[PDB]
Paper text:
Phylogenetic analysis shows that, within the rhodopsin superfamily, viral rhodopsins form a monophyletic family that consists of two distinct groups, VR1 and VR2. Here we present the results of a comprehensive structure-function study of two homologous proteins (61% sequence similarity) from the VR1 group, OLPVR1 (ADX06642.1), and VirChR1 (TARA-146-SRF-0.22-3-C376786_1). In this work, we demonstrate that VR1 rhodopsins are Na+/K+ selective light-gated ion channels that are inhibited by divalent cations. VirChR1s have proteorhodopsin-like architecture with short extracellular loops and share several structural features, such as membrane-associated ICL2 helix and an unconventional TM6-TM7 orientation.
Here, we present a high-resolution structure of another VR1 protein, OLPVR1, at 1.4 Å resolution. Type A rhombic crystals were grown at pH 8.0 using the monopalmitolein (MP) host lipid matrix and have the P21212 space group with one protein molecule in the asymmetric unit. Type A and type B crystals resulted in the obtaining of the OLPVR1 structures at the resolution of 1.4 and 1.6 Å, respectively. OLPVR1 molecules are nearly identical in both structures (root mean square deviation (RMSD) less than 0.2 Å), so hereafter, we refer to the structure from type A crystals as it has the highest resolution. The OLPVR1 protein (residues 2–223), all-trans retinal (ATR) covalently bound to K204 (K257 in CrChR28), 9 lipid molecules, and 107 water molecules are clearly resolved in the electron density maps. 2Fo–Fc electron density maps at 1.4 Å reveal two alternative conformations of the retinal in the region of the β-ionone ring. At the same time, the configuration near the Schiff base in both of them is all-trans 15-anti. Strikingly different from other rhodopsins, the intracellular parts of TM6 and TM7 helices of OLPVR1 are significantly moved apart from each other far enough to form a pore. The pore is located at about 8 Å from the cytoplasmic side of the lipid membrane border and connects the inside of the protein with the groove on its surface, which leads further to the intracellular bulk. Surprisingly, in our structure, the groove and a part of the pore are occupied with a fragment of the lipid molecule, a host lipid of the crystallization matrix (MP and MO in case of 1.4 and 1.6 Å structures, respectively), which is likely to be a crystallization artifact and is discussed in more details in the Supplementary Notes.
Numbering used by the authors: 2 to 224
Write the structure that this text describes.
């Protein structure tokens, strides 16, 4: 019953986060802060895919007859590249001397951003092969972890600066994504409970963070 309970907890946070995010879109922004709204729009698009998966899950769990963990990959293969792009946009926001927008970043860096998303795709493909038992768990863990490390290395060396604001955002995200790999080791129920709660942290906490940064930047404009 704890897969269902953790799914409901995840859905609860998704709904409240979506409401917060929509109000966030309409907060007026100073010039330098425009990219924060570009990030929040993409986080809301991630939420649409996440929500469709979670409604599918709670309906499916009524009559589970097979191990449905692999179905998460149809969400992740869409959401995780968008989340890596929004992370790049947020690092560029933090670290850039004057105003920066996603078009400037995309137009400049599309090849490198492709590399990041291709590394991430290989991580997911290896996970999917392990989840569907087309390769053994040990090969899945080692190959998946290799591409997780490559993704986060490529992100670090291009987009971070050496300060504690950067270390918090980078290492929080790295640890949370690593813990999806940790979950892979566990039996059906425990693994799926872990994913249900991890999604709150990887997706919804990120949205709430961006909302609070917008509110902080814009508070004086609002009042």
């Amino acid at each position: 019953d704890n897969i269902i309970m953790t799914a409901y907890i995840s859905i609860f946070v998704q709904i409240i986060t979506a409401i917060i995010s929509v109000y966030g879109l309409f907060i007026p922004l100073n010039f330098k802060d425009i990219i924060l709204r570009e990030i929040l729009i993409l986080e809301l698009i991630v939420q649409i895919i996440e929500f469709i998966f979670y409604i599918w899950l709670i309906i499916t769990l009524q009559s589970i007859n097979e191990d449905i963990t692999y179905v998460r990959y149809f969400d992740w293969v869409l959401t995780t590249p968008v989340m890596l792009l929004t992370t790049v946009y947020f690092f560029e926001y933090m670290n850039s001397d004057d105003g920066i927008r996603k078009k400037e970043i995309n137009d400049r860096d599309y090849v490198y951003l492709f590399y990041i998303c291709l590394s991430n795709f290989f991580m997911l493909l290896i996970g999917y092969l392990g989840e569907t038992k087309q390769i053994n768990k040990m090969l899945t863990l080692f190959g998946g972890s290799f591409f997780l490390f490559l993704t986060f290395y490529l992100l670090y060396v291009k987009y971070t600066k050496e300060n504690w604001m950067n270390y918090i955002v980078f290492y929080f995200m790295f640890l949370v994504w690593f813990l999806y790999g940790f979950a892979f080791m566990f039996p059906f129920s425990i693994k799926n409970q872990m994913y249900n709660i991890l999604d709150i942290v990887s997706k919804n906490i990120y949205s709430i963070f961006i909302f609070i940064v917008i509110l902080n930047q814009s508070y004086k404009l609002l009042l």
